[PDB]
Protein backbone atom coordinates (compact mmCIF):
# COMPACT_ATOMS: atom_id res chain seq x y z
CA UNK A 1 0.00 0.00 0.00
CA UNK A 2 1.33 3.49 -0.84
CA UNK A 3 0.07 7.09 -1.00
CA UNK A 4 0.88 10.02 -3.31
CA UNK A 5 1.76 13.50 -1.99
CA UNK A 6 1.32 16.61 -4.14
CA UNK A 7 3.20 19.91 -3.69
CA UNK A 8 1.87 23.39 -4.53
CA UNK A 9 4.66 23.45 -7.14
CA UNK A 10 3.17 20.60 -9.20
CA UNK A 11 5.62 17.80 -8.32
CA UNK A 12 4.20 14.46 -7.10
CA UNK A 13 5.69 11.82 -4.78
CA UNK A 14 4.19 8.56 -3.49
CA UNK A 15 5.19 6.85 -0.22
CA UNK A 16 4.03 3.40 0.96
CA UNK A 17 1.05 3.62 3.35
CA UNK A 18 3.26 2.58 6.28
CA UNK A 19 5.92 4.92 4.88
CA UNK A 20 3.32 7.70 4.79
CA UNK A 21 1.84 6.52 8.11
CA UNK A 22 4.72 8.50 9.64
CA UNK A 23 2.72 11.68 8.98
CA UNK A 24 -0.10 11.01 11.46
CA UNK A 25 -2.43 12.90 9.09
CA UNK A 26 -1.73 11.16 5.77
CA UNK A 27 -2.73 7.80 7.30
CA UNK A 28 -6.04 9.23 8.57
CA UNK A 29 -6.67 10.66 5.09
CA UNK A 30 -6.37 7.25 3.39
CA UNK A 31 -9.76 6.57 5.01
CA UNK A 32 -10.65 9.87 6.73
CA UNK A 33 -14.38 10.37 7.27
CA UNK A 34 -14.87 12.12 3.91
CA UNK A 35 -16.73 11.39 0.65
CA UNK A 36 -15.20 9.08 -1.99
CA UNK A 37 -14.52 10.56 -5.45
CA UNK A 38 -14.62 8.29 -8.52
CA UNK A 39 -10.82 8.54 -8.29
CA UNK A 40 -8.09 10.05 -6.06
CA UNK A 41 -7.52 7.25 -3.52
CA UNK A 42 -4.75 6.82 -0.91
CA UNK A 43 -3.33 10.23 -1.88
CA UNK A 44 -2.21 13.37 -0.01
CA UNK A 45 -2.69 17.06 -0.85
CA UNK A 46 -0.64 19.85 0.74
CA UNK A 47 -1.65 23.38 -0.34
CA UNK A 48 1.18 24.77 1.83
CA UNK A 49 4.12 22.43 1.17
CA UNK A 50 6.53 22.63 -1.77
CA UNK A 51 7.85 19.49 -3.53
CA UNK A 52 11.34 19.81 -1.99
CA UNK A 53 9.76 20.07 1.48
CA UNK A 54 7.22 17.21 1.21
CA UNK A 55 10.17 14.98 0.23
CA UNK A 56 12.38 16.29 3.03
CA UNK A 57 9.97 15.29 5.81
CA UNK A 58 9.01 12.20 3.78
CA UNK A 59 12.56 10.91 4.23
CA UNK A 60 11.85 10.82 7.97
CA UNK A 61 8.60 8.99 7.15
CA UNK A 62 10.70 6.03 6.02
CA UNK A 63 13.71 6.71 8.26
CA UNK A 64 11.42 6.71 11.32
CA UNK A 65 9.81 3.39 10.30
CA UNK A 66 13.10 1.45 10.51
CA UNK A 67 14.31 3.66 13.37
CA UNK A 68 11.19 3.07 15.48
CA UNK A 69 12.62 -0.35 16.41
CA UNK A 70 16.27 0.78 16.60
CA UNK A 71 17.02 3.15 19.50
CA UNK A 72 20.82 3.34 19.15
CA UNK A 73 22.03 5.91 16.58
CA UNK A 74 19.12 7.87 15.04
CA UNK A 75 21.00 10.77 13.46
CA UNK A 76 19.42 14.17 12.71
CA UNK A 77 18.25 15.75 9.42
CA UNK A 78 20.35 18.65 8.13
CA UNK A 79 18.72 22.09 8.45
CA UNK A 80 19.93 25.43 7.03
CA UNK A 81 18.90 28.78 5.55
CA UNK A 82 17.54 27.27 2.32
CA UNK A 83 15.44 24.30 3.38
CA UNK A 84 13.64 23.56 6.69
CA UNK A 85 11.64 26.80 7.02
CA UNK A 86 8.62 25.26 5.26
CA UNK A 87 8.99 22.12 7.41
CA UNK A 88 8.31 24.35 10.44
CA UNK A 89 4.54 24.34 9.82
CA UNK A 90 4.64 21.43 7.33
CA UNK A 91 6.87 19.03 9.30
CA UNK A 92 4.85 19.74 12.47
CA UNK A 93 1.58 19.57 10.49
CA UNK A 94 2.52 15.97 9.61
CA UNK A 95 2.37 14.72 13.23
CA UNK A 96 5.51 12.69 14.03
Amino acid sequence: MYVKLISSDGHEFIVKREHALTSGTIKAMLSGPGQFAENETNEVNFREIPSHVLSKVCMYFTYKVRYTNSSTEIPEFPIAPEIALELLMAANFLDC
Binding site: T22, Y60, F77, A84, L85, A91, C96
Partner: peptide, 15 residues
Amino acid sequence: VATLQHLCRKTVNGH
Protein backbone atom coordinates in the same frame (compact mmCIF):
# COMPACT_ATOMS: atom_id res chain seq x y z
CA VAL B 1 13.42 8.81 15.84
CA ALA B 2 11.47 11.96 15.26
CA THR B 3 9.70 13.33 12.18
CA LEU B 4 10.93 16.47 10.39
CA GLN B 5 8.94 18.69 12.79
CA HIS B 6 11.64 18.45 15.49
CA LEU B 7 14.60 18.73 13.07
CA CYS B 8 13.09 21.91 11.60
CA ARG B 9 12.93 23.52 15.07
CA LYS B 10 16.66 22.85 15.57
CA THR B 11 17.52 25.64 13.10
CA VAL B 12 14.77 28.02 14.26
CA ASN B 13 15.55 27.35 17.94
CA GLY B 14 19.34 27.71 17.54
CA HIS B 15 19.76 29.29 14.09
